[PDB]
């Protein structure tokens, strides 16, 4: 037994290098061990299991090995339970030990996935861990157990997680739990649907006590010392290092913790006020824009009304970020944050208004509607001078003219126009330019002449949905191209483009170009160009089915009439897609269709475009 155990452990530890994985040796060893594992103790089996497993070795012999040892461990544990109520079953009580259960959880948790046998086995060891929980004294082992369960994608019973949290509470005195393991446990418990708020309260307390202890330690060091008695990039790095030293966590994860606490309804006084001065303020400059947005939404949900935090953030955004660099979403979130009447008025509201004007005038629907609502909320306050609202009046007139343009294009929904008109009516706005009156007259003509039905029949629903999805992908919070667009969003956009014909997509792209100039991202333009090229190439399109299998769908026969193809040529001329405009395949297909239909001017244009391309 000992010789075979040593040999198999030596081979398993030698299999760390992929060059040392051999088929002959594994074929010699694994079945011989397979037939004799009924003579092996649970400790020996776990020692064999714990050694490193090669991927090929795991797929060829590892999975069945683990399943059989799991079955044997379940059998010996059942025998031990019956006793409490190859001679190994006779001594099953001693073999099944709490340390054995803990190491089994740690090892098989990170090695198993979403399987039925794994689920049953894990439920068995969870019941046995409930039986032997009280013996463990290091909460880090429980944290590792929770992480293993999270990897396994299996949710134990709620009472089990409550017991684990109570054990965390009990064991924390003897051995304090670190802030990073506390964060990991918090994420795991939130992901596995643990509703009980007490564990979240305890974990937040465990994080905050460590943070304030470190802050007090540095302050007492400074006080004892005094009793005895690119530069921007460098400052950002130093601030990040200080924050990581104090909180033992990256700023993004701290901000997402704060956002989670805000979502769960925790008070702002006990979780933002203590950390505002030492943590948030000095590290604010080095935050990534995603962390900026998360923190802004955290303050919004927390209903924070402390100018001590509000004013420096506005000062940083106005003087250290610049209007061109700050995403308008964060600016809108800040304006909503200062909107509520209970929020005291900061002394630098004019800076925020000027930044809003600069950002929303340099760039060039529902967004304008919400902007108008929050401007109304700001104007409701009596501490706002009229002259400071004078630029906001011009902003609202700009929005009115933009709606004047959108109503002519039959793109904007009339409900948003009604909401905007109601806003201007309840604001008693001084419509000096009169564009609001012209908008109301055009809305009256819409309601009287054609109606909403004819207005919505002016265009195609497919084009509208393609435009909406294109705008959503383009307006996704990439935070100034800081983060690449998600692969899941890429797949969703590709699926949306696949189900829609090329002509509708081109019409949507032309409408987007007309409405917004130079507002299309390079990635979305490349995606649209690839979709159109694949559609018109004749080689088919790659579609990801419900089984996640790539299938070559043949291109749909676009039955284009003479007028329809002339419109297609016009859209090709007016599209912002340079690749599509210069694509020889599209022009060749248009030439073929023109030859089949028999028009001469389109043929001449296609010939000239092909000559220029070649």
């Amino acid at each position: 037994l000992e010789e075979l155990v040593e040999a198999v452990t030596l081979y398993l530890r030698a299999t760390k290098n992929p060059r040392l994985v051999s088929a002959d040796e594994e074929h010699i060893f694994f079945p011989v061990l397979m037939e004799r594992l009924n003579e092996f103790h649970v400790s020996q089996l776990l020692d064999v299991v714990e050694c490193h497993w090669a991927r090929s070795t795991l797929v060829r012999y590892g999975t069945t090995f683990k399943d059989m040892v799991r079955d044997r461990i379940a059998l010996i544990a059942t025998a031990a339970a019956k006793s409490a109520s190859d001679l190994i079953i006779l001594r099953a009580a001693e073999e099944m030990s709490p340390e054995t259960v803990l190491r089994c959880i740690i090892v098989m948790g990170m090695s198993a996935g979403r399987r039925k046998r794994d689920l049953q086995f894990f439920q068995a060891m969870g019941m046995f861990l409930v039986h032997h929980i009280n013996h463990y004294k290091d909460p880090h082992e429980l944290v590792r157990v929770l992480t293993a369960f999270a990897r396994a994608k299996i949710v134990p019973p709620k009472r089990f997680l409550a017991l684990l949290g109570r054990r965390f509470a009990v064991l924390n005195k003897r051995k304090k739990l670190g802030s990073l393991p506390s964060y990991r446990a918090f994420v795991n418990l939130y992901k596995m649907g643990h509703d009980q708020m007490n564990t979240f309260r305890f974990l937040a307390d465990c994080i905050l006590e460590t943070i304030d202890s470190n802050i007090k330690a540095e302050k007492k060091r400074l006080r004892l010392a005094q009793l005895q008695s690119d530069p921007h990039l460098l400052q950002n790095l130093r601030a990040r290092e200080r924050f990581k030293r104090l909180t033992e966590l990256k700023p993004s994860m701290f901000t997402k913790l704060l956002l989670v606490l805000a979502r769960f309804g925790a008070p702002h006084q006990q979780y933002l006020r203590p950390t505002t001065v030492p943590l948030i303020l000095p590290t604010l400059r080095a935050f990534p824009p995603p962390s900026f947005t998360r923190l802004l939404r955290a303050m919004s949900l927390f209903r924070t009304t402390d100018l001590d935090l509000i004013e420096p953030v506005i000062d940083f955004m106005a003087d250290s970020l610049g209007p061109t660099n700050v995403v308008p979403a964060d600016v809108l979130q800040m304006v909503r944050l200062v909107a509520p009447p209970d929020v005291p008025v900061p002394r630098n509201l004019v800076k925020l208004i000027s930044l809003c004007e600069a950002v929303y005038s340099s760039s060039a629907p529902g967004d304008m509607c919400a902007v108008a609502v929050v401007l109304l909320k700001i104007q409701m306050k009596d501490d706002v001078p009229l002259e400071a609202l004078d630029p906001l009046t011009r902003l609202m007139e700009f929005f009115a003219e933009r709606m004047y343009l959108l109503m002519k294009l039959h793109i904007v929904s009339l409900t948003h126009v009604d909401v905007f008109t109601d806003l201007c009516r309840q604001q008693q706005h001084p419509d000096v330019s009169g564009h609001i009156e012209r908008l109301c007259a055009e809305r009256r003509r819409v309601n009287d002449a054609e109606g909403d039905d004819e207005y919505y029949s002016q265009l195609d629903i497919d084009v509208r949905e393609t435009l909406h999805r294109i705008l959503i992908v383009n307006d996704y919070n990439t935070y100034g191209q800081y983060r690449p667009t998600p692969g899941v969003l890429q797949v969703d956009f590709k699926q949306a483009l696949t189900e829609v014909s090329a002509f509708d997509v081109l019409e949507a792209a032309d409408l987007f170009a007309q409405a917004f100039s130079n507002a299309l991202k390079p990635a979305v333009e490349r995606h649209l160009s690839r979709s159109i090229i694949a559609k018109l190439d004749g080689g088919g399109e790659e579609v990801i089915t419900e089984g996640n299998s790539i299938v070559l769908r043949p291109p749909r026969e676009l039955l284009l009439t003479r007028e329809d193809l002339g419109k297609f040529v016009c859209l090709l001329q007016r599209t912002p897609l340079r690749r599509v405009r210069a694509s020889p395949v599209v022009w060749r297909f248009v030439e073929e269709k023109a030859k089949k239909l028999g028009m001469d001017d389109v043929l001449r244009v296609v010939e000239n475009k092909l000559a220029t391309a070649v």
């Binding site: 007492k220 004892l224 009793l227 008070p267 006084q269």
Partner: protein, 218 residues
């Protein structure tokens, strides 16, 4: 501090009195290290006191009795809140209520301590508040400073139903319930039950009479 939302002013004052009464004993401080820790705890205490004065300002906004503001200022000075702006608001509020107040209801010891707590410059700016505090401390109530926080809450604000009932109070409530269940026509049983109630009226809650009289109405 965590579970403090929509705090009645009386309950906040009672909690402040409890915090004051549980203050640590003062000993000679080692000037090297542990006095630094003393200041380190003092700043946290001051932050908690700032959280408290937030609700104090809220209570000023909605409206509070003079007894509540006097007790809150007493406790805040005893713990230590040297802002000199909140005290200006306190003096302003007392000046607002100076005419519509009675010196025969407030506490003399509280008046002396709050007059000491409020700076002489603040009283110089507000003379009517100074006269009112002088009148209260010269003529008022004595003995309300040594009362336990629960006794202070009960005497100051009845109908709180926070502390558990004693045996005599529970017996009185049982008598009230049995009177309620009894029919109106049966005058003898009601007379007997009322006579039983008034035999222990001294040891029962004063506010509970509002229920007792109600039976006579129903």
């Amino acid at each position: 501090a965590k579970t403090a939302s929509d705090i009645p002013m009386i309950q906040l004052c009672a909690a402040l009195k409890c915090f004051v009464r549980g203050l640590m004993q003062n000993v000679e401080t080692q000037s090297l290290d542990e006095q630094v820790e003393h200041e380190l705890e003092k700043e946290d205490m001051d932050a908690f006191l700032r959280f408290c004065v937030e609700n104090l300002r809220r209570g000023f906004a909605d409206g509070m009795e003079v007894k509540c503001v006097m007790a809150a200022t007493e406790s805040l000075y005893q713990l230590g809140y040297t802002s000199t702006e909140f005290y200006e608001q306190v003096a302003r509020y007392l000046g607002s209520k100076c005419s519509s107040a009675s010196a025969s209801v407030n506490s003399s010891e509280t008046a002396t301590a709050v007059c000491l707590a409020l700076g002489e410059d603040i009283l110089d700016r507000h003379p009517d508040v100074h006269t009112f505090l002088l009148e209260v401390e010269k003529s008022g109530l004595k003995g309300e400073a040594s009362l336990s926080p629960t006794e202070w809450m009960n005497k100051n604000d009845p109908a709180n139903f926070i502390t558990p009932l004693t045996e005599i109070q529970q017996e009185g409530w049982n008598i009230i319930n049995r009177m309620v269940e009894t029919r109106a026509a049966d005058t003898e049983k009601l007379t007997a039950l009322a006579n039983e109630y008034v035999a222990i009226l001294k040891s029962t809650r004063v506010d509970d009479l509002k229920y007792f009289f109600g039976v006579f109405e129903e």
